[PDB]
A and B are shown apart, each in its own frame.
Chain A
Amino acid sequence: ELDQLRQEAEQLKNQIRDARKACADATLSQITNNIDPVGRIQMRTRRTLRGHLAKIYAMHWGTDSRLLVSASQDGKLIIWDSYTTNKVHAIPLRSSWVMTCAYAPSGNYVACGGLDNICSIYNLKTREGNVRVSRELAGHTGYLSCCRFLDDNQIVTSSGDTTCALWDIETGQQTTTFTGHTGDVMSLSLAPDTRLFVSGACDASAKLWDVREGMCRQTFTGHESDINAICFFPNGNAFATGSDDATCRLFDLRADQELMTYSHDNIICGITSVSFSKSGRLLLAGYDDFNCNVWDALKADRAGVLAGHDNRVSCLGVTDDGMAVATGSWDSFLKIWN
């Protein structure tokens, strides 16, 4: 019973690895040898946002590249203004332990999650003027890790009980549940088409999930440790992943294998959050040794090093027009780099 299934499962995984090796005609770095290098990219701290009490775990830009939500462990959700360093809102949270925050594409709602395994949506267009809990979603068992808005009606969440759900905000129930992962699902990254997403779990395997169908299409098994953050390439045909083994990796949705690996011998610290740029030439990686390296996505060589934080860079964001790059670390300050 259990031995014929696992033997069939092992012959299927040899077929997949034969496929992946037949398709591997060459590598990306050989092709890209006749490419002009980027050179040294030096960025300076244009702004510092000050006023948090505890460490800043996650943050998310707006679609107008103006207002960013920042989430902290003190129980405060502060909506910032990036140009004038003004706090346009400050929201007191029920649970002090927050692990994610999302900003709506219309700018009407903000969601937050955490160790209280409940996604809380806050309205920002109340006629009274006070922020209030619009609804609470208590379906998951494990902690809530990353949550992102598809629109004002449907939000996608990443729990810690190896399950991703598709929530409806109006009915308050789970539309589609994804139960493919075996390890703790760390973060999810929505596609620009908002039809697919990818989640990296702690089982060293990234999956490609269809929202409307409800099943995974592809499995990527190139890593060696816990996949911390995942981000799509801006065309929707590739993604990048950061893990604890100090290696960023680039994956293809068509070739179904790793294209390139971003590794250096001097740095052995983990990789917290990775965001592409607007063009996709610069890969930005928030490492665990208190600074950010600006990797070249086509040459695998560090342009430059963003050493401005006192503690580990917890999360990294890039505006939709690519104008600035904000990093939040565990010293409670948000540096805006340009």
Chain B
Amino acid sequence: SVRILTACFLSLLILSTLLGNTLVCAAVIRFRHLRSKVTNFFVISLAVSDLLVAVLVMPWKAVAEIAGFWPFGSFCNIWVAFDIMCSTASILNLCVISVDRYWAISSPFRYERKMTPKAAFILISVAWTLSVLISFIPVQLSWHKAKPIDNCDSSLSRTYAISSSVISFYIPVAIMIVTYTRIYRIAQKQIRRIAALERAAVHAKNCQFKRETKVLKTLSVIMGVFVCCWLPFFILNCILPFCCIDSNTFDVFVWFGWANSSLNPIIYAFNADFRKAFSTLLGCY
């Protein structure tokens, strides 16, 4: 009854995430100018991380939810490690991009000299190594599992729930709130300078708010979509072991976290070069 309807939404979600991430990766490989800018290196890392979710994390959980049981019980221990890795890799890549956008807009001269492509890789490599240091070591040593029809009910322990959340969510969202607030200080000042020149012109011609909405809309869409998806799941994730929260309800919030991986390409690849690349590659226009 309600399984038919639910199956369609989950299948569209997987296909949407697969579609967008594939197009972003293909477009950057098949165009050199999308590889000359050092900024677009990070969007490659964010398209690979988001594509590992759709390929390897989303289907198995979807199959288990529709069917009700867990098909292969040994694969549950391995799945958890890839679930932690693919989520943390997505959130850390979104922190690297903000730090990239704050280096270029604050100090534009130093950003040309210091940002070698060499150092670009060093940012990407600390992100992906933190993801494997948080996931494959504790889950296989089973620090989280020993808290005191087969199910994959991985109840995280007290130690590992708090610790993983701080290194994967709370630190990168502390960096991102301080980052984008400063970029909204810089952008606001520039509009004031334009408004001074504009109004003198208007005053001279007569004697003879739209820009500010754009500044606030762009930053709101980036911060708003990311926070709304992951905040009602990391609040619950810290509470749940300490604790209430039903299993059905908690399940629903996991999908909202994963849904952010579907909306990540459209938010960051609505640029002039990317849109031109999309029309060519897909062949629509």
Which of A50, A310, A331 counts the most chain B CB atoms within 10 A?
A: A310
B residues within 8 A CB of A48?
32
Quick one: which of B21-48 are within 8 Å of A by CB? 32-33
CB distance from B22 to the nearest CB of A (A): 24
B residues within 8 A CB of A310?
33
A residues within 8 A CB of B33?
310, 331
How many B residues are at the interface, by size bracket? under 10
Find the A residue at minimum CB distance from B33.
A310
CA distance A18 to B32 in the complex (A): 57
Q: What's the dominant secondary structure at chain A's contact region? A: loop
Quick one: which of A167-206 are within 8 Å of B by CB? none
CA distance A50 to B32 in the complex (A): 10
A residues within 8 A CB of B32?
48, 50
CA distance A48 to B31 in the complex (A): 12
Find the B residue at minimum CB distance from A50.
B32
Find the B residue at minimum CB distance from A48.
B32
B200-214 vs A, CB cutoff 8 Å, 1 = contact: the mask equals 000000000000000
CB distance from A22 to the nearest CB of B (A): 53
CA distance A325 to B84 in the complex (A): 54
Find the B residue at minimum CB distance from A310.
B33
Find the A residue at minimum CB distance from B31.
A310
CA distance A50 to B33 in the complex (A): 12
CA distance A48 to B32 in the complex (A): 11
A39-65 vs B, CB cutoff 8 Å, 1 = contact: the mask equals 000000000101000000000000000
CB distance from A208 to the nearest CB of B (A): 43
B residues within 8 A CB of A50?
32
A290-313 vs B, CB cutoff 8 Å, 1 = contact: the mask equals 000000000000000000001000
CB distance from A54 to the nearest CB of B (A): 14
CA distance A310 to B32 in the complex (A): 11
CA distance A331 to B31 in the complex (A): 13
Binding site for B on A (CB under 8 A): 48, 50, 310, 331
Closest 4 CB pairs of A and B: A310-B33, A331-B33, A50-B32, A48-B32
4 A–B pairs (Cβ distance < 8 Å), ordered by A: A48-B32, A50-B32, A310-B33, A331-B33
